[PDB]
Amino acid sequence: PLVFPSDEFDASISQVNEKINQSLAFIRKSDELLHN
Amino acid sequence: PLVFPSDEFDASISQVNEKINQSLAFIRKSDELLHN
Amino acid sequence: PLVFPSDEFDASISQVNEKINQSLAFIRKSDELLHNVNAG
Amino acid sequence: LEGEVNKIKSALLSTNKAVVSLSNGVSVLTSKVLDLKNYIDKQLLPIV
Amino acid sequence: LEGEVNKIKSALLSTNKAVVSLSNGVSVLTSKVLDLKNYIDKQLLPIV
Amino acid sequence: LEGEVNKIKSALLSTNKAVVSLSNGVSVLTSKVLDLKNYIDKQLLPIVNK
């Protein structure tokens, strides 16, 4: 039988997208300061 | 017969490289100013 | 025997992780210097 | 010192754009890796 | 000027956290790509 | 402030190198992902089919 470890895979990919958005947020603040 | 969506996939991978390239170009302009 | 190009795949993946580390080593240095400029 | 600081500000602005550009690229790459996993799971496995 | 750079110092600090975040992202993504390759090699292929 | 406008300069320079590195890391990851896709497409499927 073949059972892909799918739910973990999906949770990890969501963790990746979360880190990407955090990244964009830290940048959004750096830009803010600069424009001040 | 299964048919992999291998044309939109190439196109997406191509845009990923373009962004990696843009990223490098921006750092190039940043190091330039700093060296100036 | 189809054969997955495994040895080369693992080599590349190891190169990716080695680059992530060097990236973080550069950031560590940048922070170290920035906490050296003045105060909070 | 004015421009010295005004040069650095401009560089940092390019650097920020660099990080955003890379993040967007990783975002796209992440969806394609998900696509590969879903293809293997939903399309390939059921037939093997 | 104490301030114009002040923002810059804090701005670079936030830019640095952005890179640490994207790095952690890329790090997890890398493990998943490795998982796929291992799944195809050790699970799928033997049965194909 | 002088010696501090230079510190920040050296820090940014290190931050830029941090981005160049991560970018090269992602570049290689991208080529491996394409590799996986091509393997499934050009090597696996044809056998999973005929």
Curated annotation (Swiss-Prot), chains D, E:
Subcellular location: Virion membrane; Host cell membrane
Stretches assigned to coiled coil: 1-48
Protein topology in the membrane: Single-pass type I membrane protein; Single-pass membrane protein
Superkingdom, taxonomy of origin: Viruses
Function in brief: Class I viral fusion protein. Under the current model, the protein has at least 3 conformational states: pre-fusion native state, pre-hairpin intermediate state, and post-fusion hairpin state. During viral and plasma cell membrane fusion, the coiled coil regions assume a trimer-of-hairpins structure, positioning the fusion peptide in close proximity to the C-terminal region of the ectodomain. The formation of this structure appears to drive apposition and subsequent fusion of viral and cellular membranes leading to delivery of the nucleocapsid into the cytoplasm.
Free-text comment about domains: The N-terminus is a hydrophobic fusion peptide that inserts into the target host membrane. It is buried in the center of the trimer cavity before cleavage by host furin. The coiled coil (heptad repeat) regions are probably involved in homotrimerization, heterodimerization and in the formation of a fusion-active hairpin structure.
Quaternary structure (record): Homotrimer. Heterodimer with fusion protein F2; disulfide-linked. Interacts with host NCL; this interaction plays a role in viral entry into the host cell. As a heterodimer with F2, interacts with host heparan sulfate. As a heterodimer with F2, interacts with host IGF1R; this interaction activates PRKCZ/PKCzeta that recruits NCL/nucleolin from the host nucleus to the plasma membrane. Part of a complex composed of F1, F2 and G glycoproteins. As a heterodimer with F2, interacts with host RHOA; this interaction facilitates virus-induced syncytium formation.
Designated name of the protein: Fusion glycoprotein F1
Organism field: Human respiratory syncytial virus A (strain RSS-2)
Classification lineage: Viruses, Riboviria, Orthornavirae, Negarnaviricota, Haploviricotina
Designated gene of the protein: F
UniProtKB/Swiss-Prot annotation, chain F:
Subcellular location(s) per record: Virion membrane; Host cell membrane
Superkingdom in the source lineage: Viruses
Residue stretches in coiled coil: 1-50
Subunit-level organization: Homotrimer. Heterodimer with fusion protein F2; disulfide-linked. Interacts with host NCL; this interaction plays a role in viral entry into the host cell. As a heterodimer with F2, interacts with host heparan sulfate. As a heterodimer with F2, interacts with host IGF1R; this interaction activates PRKCZ/PKCzeta that recruits NCL/nucleolin from the host nucleus to the plasma membrane. Part of a complex composed of F1, F2 and G glycoproteins. As a heterodimer with F2, interacts with host RHOA; this interaction facilitates virus-induced syncytium formation.
Purpose of the protein: Class I viral fusion protein. Under the current model, the protein has at least 3 conformational states: pre-fusion native state, pre-hairpin intermediate state, and post-fusion hairpin state. During viral and plasma cell membrane fusion, the coiled coil regions assume a trimer-of-hairpins structure, positioning the fusion peptide in close proximity to the C-terminal region of the ectodomain. The formation of this structure appears to drive apposition and subsequent fusion of viral and cellular membranes leading to delivery of the nucleocapsid into the cytoplasm.
Domains: entry comment: The N-terminus is a hydrophobic fusion peptide that inserts into the target host membrane. It is buried in the center of the trimer cavity before cleavage by host furin. The coiled coil (heptad repeat) regions are probably involved in homotrimerization, heterodimerization and in the formation of a fusion-active hairpin structure.
Name of the protein described by the UniProt record: Fusion glycoprotein F1
Species of provenance: Human respiratory syncytial virus A (strain RSS-2)
The organism's taxonomic lineage, starting at the top: Viruses, Riboviria, Orthornavirae, Negarnaviricota, Haploviricotina
Encoding gene, per UniProt annotation: F
